[PDB]
Write a protein that holds these residues in place. Structure first.
Motif, PDB file in Angstrom:
ATOM      1  N   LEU A 172       0.996  -1.120   0.402  1.00  0.00           N
ATOM      2  CA  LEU A 172       0.274  -0.139   0.297  1.00  0.00           C
ATOM      3  C   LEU A 172       0.837   1.058  -0.031  1.00  0.00           C
ATOM      4  O   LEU A 172       1.478   2.147   1.549  1.00  0.00           O
ATOM      5  N   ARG A 173       1.234   2.033  -1.321  1.00  0.00           N
ATOM      6  CA  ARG A 173       2.058   3.137  -0.873  1.00  0.00           C
ATOM      7  C   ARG A 173       1.483   4.237  -0.266  1.00  0.00           C
ATOM      8  O   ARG A 173       0.394   4.440  -0.099  1.00  0.00           O
ATOM      9  N   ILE A 174       2.554   5.034   0.637  1.00  0.00           N
ATOM     10  CA  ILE A 174       2.174   5.593   1.542  1.00  0.00           C
ATOM     11  C   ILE A 174       3.232   6.929   0.682  1.00  0.00           C
ATOM     12  O   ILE A 174       4.457   7.117   0.520  1.00  0.00           O
ATOM     13  N   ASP A 175       2.067   8.112   1.136  1.00  0.00           N
ATOM     14  CA  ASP A 175       2.391   9.153   0.883  1.00  0.00           C
ATOM     15  C   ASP A 175       3.296   9.536   2.426  1.00  0.00           C
ATOM     16  O   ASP A 175       2.772  10.205   3.833  1.00  0.00           O
ATOM     17  N   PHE A 176       4.369   9.767   2.395  1.00  0.00           N
ATOM     18  CA  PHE A 176       5.779  10.322   3.548  1.00  0.00           C
ATOM     19  C   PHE A 176       5.555  11.178   4.072  1.00  0.00           C
ATOM     20  O   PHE A 176       5.571  12.030   5.770  1.00  0.00           O
ATOM     21  N   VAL A 177       5.226  12.198   3.836  1.00  0.00           N
ATOM     22  CA  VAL A 177       5.008  13.950   4.048  1.00  0.00           C
ATOM     23  C   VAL A 177       3.286  13.905   4.049  1.00  0.00           C
ATOM     24  O   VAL A 177       3.734  14.445   4.596  1.00  0.00           O
ATOM     25  N   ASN A 178       3.000  14.059   3.476  1.00  0.00           N
ATOM     26  CA  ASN A 178       1.344  14.041   4.157  1.00  0.00           C
ATOM     27  C   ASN A 178       0.799  12.832   5.251  1.00  0.00           C
ATOM     28  O   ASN A 178      -0.596  13.132   5.870  1.00  0.00           O
ATOM     29  N   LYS A 179       1.717  12.027   4.955  1.00  0.00           N
ATOM     30  CA  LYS A 179       1.306  11.003   6.446  1.00  0.00           C
ATOM     31  C   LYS A 179      -0.074   9.598   5.885  1.00  0.00           C
ATOM     32  O   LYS A 179      -0.810   9.319   7.017  1.00  0.00           O
ATOM     33  N   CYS A 180      -0.275   9.624   4.735  1.00  0.00           N
ATOM     34  CA  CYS A 180      -1.156   8.360   4.550  1.00  0.00           C
ATOM     35  C   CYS A 180      -1.562   8.372   3.148  1.00  0.00           C
ATOM     36  O   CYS A 180      -0.608   8.042   1.809  1.00  0.00           O
ATOM     37  N   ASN A 181      -1.893   7.227   2.888  1.00  0.00           N
ATOM     38  CA  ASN A 181      -1.979   6.398   1.626  1.00  0.00           C
ATOM     39  C   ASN A 181      -2.193   7.246   0.606  1.00  0.00           C
ATOM     40  O   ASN A 181      -2.832   8.400   0.496  1.00  0.00           O
ATOM     41  N   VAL A 182      -2.015   6.645  -0.696  1.00  0.00           N
ATOM     42  CA  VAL A 182      -1.928   7.271  -2.096  1.00  0.00           C
ATOM     43  C   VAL A 182      -3.263   7.568  -2.875  1.00  0.00           C
ATOM     44  O   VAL A 182      -3.342   7.359  -4.193  1.00  0.00           O
ATOM     45  N   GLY A 183      -3.667   6.024  -3.087  1.00  0.00           N
ATOM     46  CA  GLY A 183      -5.220   5.920  -3.513  1.00  0.00           C
ATOM     47  C   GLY A 183      -5.263   4.764  -3.750  1.00  0.00           C
ATOM     48  O   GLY A 183      -5.813   4.042  -4.651  1.00  0.00           O
ATOM     49  N   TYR A 184      -3.820   3.827  -3.779  1.00  0.00           N
ATOM     50  CA  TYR A 184      -3.808   2.780  -4.450  1.00  0.00           C
ATOM     51  C   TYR A 184      -3.012   1.774  -3.789  1.00  0.00           C
ATOM     52  O   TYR A 184      -2.266   1.910  -2.793  1.00  0.00           O
ATOM     53  N   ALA A 185      -2.941   0.067  -3.854  1.00  0.00           N
ATOM     54  CA  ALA A 185      -2.204  -0.717  -3.975  1.00  0.00           C
ATOM     55  C   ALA A 185      -1.654  -1.732  -4.108  1.00  0.00           C
ATOM     56  O   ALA A 185      -2.501  -1.410  -5.426  1.00  0.00           O
ATOM     57  N   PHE A 186      -0.833  -2.832  -4.008  1.00  0.00           N
ATOM     58  CA  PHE A 186      -0.535  -3.998  -5.189  1.00  0.00           C
ATOM     59  C   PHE A 186      -0.549  -5.621  -4.455  1.00  0.00           C
ATOM     60  O   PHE A 186      -0.194  -5.557  -3.151  1.00  0.00           O
ATOM     61  N   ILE A 187      -0.935  -6.904  -4.608  1.00  0.00           N
ATOM     62  CA  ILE A 187      -1.155  -7.428  -4.401  1.00  0.00           C
ATOM     63  C   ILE A 187      -0.496  -8.621  -4.721  1.00  0.00           C
ATOM     64  O   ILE A 187      -1.321  -8.602  -6.343  1.00  0.00           O
ATOM     65  N   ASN A 188       0.019 -10.006  -4.791  1.00  0.00           N
ATOM     66  CA  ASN A 188       0.460 -10.586  -5.918  1.00  0.00           C
ATOM     67  C   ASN A 188      -0.429 -12.343  -4.798  1.00  0.00           C
ATOM     68  O   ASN A 188      -0.198 -12.029  -3.829  1.00  0.00           O
ATOM     69  N   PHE A 189      -1.387 -12.568  -5.715  1.00  0.00           N
ATOM     70  CA  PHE A 189      -1.742 -14.197  -5.561  1.00  0.00           C
ATOM     71  C   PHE A 189      -1.376 -14.795  -6.081  1.00  0.00           C
ATOM     72  O   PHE A 189      -0.543 -14.927  -6.606  1.00  0.00           O
ATOM     73  N   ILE A 190      -1.602 -16.291  -5.136  1.00  0.00           N
ATOM     74  CA  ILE A 190       0.021 -17.409  -5.044  1.00  0.00           C
ATOM     75  C   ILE A 190      -1.053 -17.928  -6.448  1.00  0.00           C
ATOM     76  O   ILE A 190      -0.273 -18.472  -7.043  1.00  0.00           O
ATOM     77  N   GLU A 191      -2.480 -17.816  -6.156  1.00  0.00           N
ATOM     78  CA  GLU A 191      -2.785 -18.249  -6.904  1.00  0.00           C
ATOM     79  C   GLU A 191      -4.447 -17.897  -8.256  1.00  0.00           C
ATOM     80  O   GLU A 191      -4.582 -16.811  -7.581  1.00  0.00           O
ATOM     81  N   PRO A 192      -4.494 -17.580  -9.683  1.00  0.00           N
ATOM     82  CA  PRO A 192      -4.898 -16.462 -10.186  1.00  0.00           C
ATOM     83  C   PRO A 192      -6.214 -16.269  -9.864  1.00  0.00           C
ATOM     84  O   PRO A 192      -7.172 -15.320  -9.860  1.00  0.00           O
ATOM     85  N   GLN A 193      -6.791 -17.731  -9.752  1.00  0.00           N
ATOM     86  CA  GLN A 193      -8.000 -18.000  -8.996  1.00  0.00           C
ATOM     87  C   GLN A 193      -9.047 -17.234  -8.321  1.00  0.00           C
ATOM     88  O   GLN A 193     -10.192 -17.115  -7.659  1.00  0.00           O
ATOM     89  N   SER A 194      -8.046 -16.524  -7.329  1.00  0.00           N
ATOM     90  CA  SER A 194      -7.919 -16.067  -6.029  1.00  0.00           C
ATOM     91  C   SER A 194      -8.416 -14.710  -6.270  1.00  0.00           C
ATOM     92  O   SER A 194      -9.254 -13.283  -5.620  1.00  0.00           O
ATOM     93  N   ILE A 195      -7.915 -13.828  -7.680  1.00  0.00           N
ATOM     94  CA  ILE A 195      -8.675 -12.346  -7.957  1.00  0.00           C
ATOM     95  C   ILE A 195      -9.637 -12.989  -8.298  1.00  0.00           C
ATOM     96  O   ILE A 195     -10.595 -11.394  -8.368  1.00  0.00           O
ATOM     97  N   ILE A 196     -10.829 -13.779  -8.631  1.00  0.00           N
ATOM     98  CA  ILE A 196     -11.457 -13.498  -8.495  1.00  0.00           C
ATOM     99  C   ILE A 196     -13.127 -13.671  -7.576  1.00  0.00           C
ATOM    100  O   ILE A 196     -13.808 -13.323  -7.030  1.00  0.00           O
ATOM    101  N   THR A 197     -12.009 -14.709  -6.401  1.00  0.00           N
ATOM    102  CA  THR A 197     -12.710 -14.865  -5.091  1.00  0.00           C
ATOM    103  C   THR A 197     -12.860 -13.331  -4.312  1.00  0.00           C
ATOM    104  O   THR A 197     -13.951 -12.876  -3.822  1.00  0.00           O
ATOM    105  N   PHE A 198     -11.579 -12.535  -4.156  1.00  0.00           N
ATOM    106  CA  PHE A 198     -11.510 -11.000  -4.509  1.00  0.00           C
ATOM    107  C   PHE A 198     -12.367  -9.867  -4.858  1.00  0.00           C
ATOM    108  O   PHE A 198     -13.105  -9.043  -4.579  1.00  0.00           O
TER     109      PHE A 198
END
Length: 148
Positions: free
Chosen positions: A51-77
């Motif tokens: 989860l990308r953080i603005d270190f100056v404003n001390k809060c996330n930037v509106g996006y994150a990145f996740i890697n699933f072990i199995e691609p089929q867990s992308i359907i579940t989420f």
RNA sequence: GCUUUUUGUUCG
């Protein structure tokens, strides 16, 4: 076009991509709240999280990145969260996803291990979890740098 | 009413 998520191509096994961009996140949402948000539907199905953080404003930037072990867990989420509001911080943002431009835990470690985001607070850093075996899902220390 | 939108060489 290329980063568009199609659940029919994941299910059929055509698209084997595992890294996904979690877009449209409330800016005051944290790394803990995101892990918890994912763990409702996808506990222990992912091996990278950032989860990308603005270190100056001390809060996330509106996006994150996740890697699933199995691609089929992308359907579940995806089916559980994409198109839904977050119900926190009076935010009217709606959850959405797309494939990440950097695919795979190995490729993500390559990128982040020598980064200056690793020198910040652990809650601001990308995290990794065991991908396979009886320790699957347990948080691991991030591989140390290898600069020159 | 709460915000940065494909990952900090730019510290906003």
């Amino acid at each position: 076009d290329r980063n568009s998520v199609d659940y029919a191509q994941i299910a059929s096994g055509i698209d084997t991509r595992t890294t996904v961009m979690i877009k449209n996140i409330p800016n005051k949402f944290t790394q803990q709240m995101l892990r918890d948000y994912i763990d409702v539907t996808n506990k222990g199905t992912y091996d990278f999280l950032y989860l990308r953080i603005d270190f100056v404003n001390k809060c996330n930037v509106g996006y994150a990145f996740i890697n699933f072990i199995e691609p089929q867990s992308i359907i579940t989420f995806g089916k559980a969260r994409v198109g839904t509001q977050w119900n926190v911080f009076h935010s009217e943002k709606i959850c959405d996803i797309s494939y990440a431009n950097i695919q795979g835990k190995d490729r993500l470690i390559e990128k982040f291990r020598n980064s200056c985001v690793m020198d910040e607070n652990p809650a601001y850093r990308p995290k990794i979890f065991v991908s396979h075996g009886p320790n699957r899902g347990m948080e691991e220390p991030f591989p140390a740098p290898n600069n020159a």
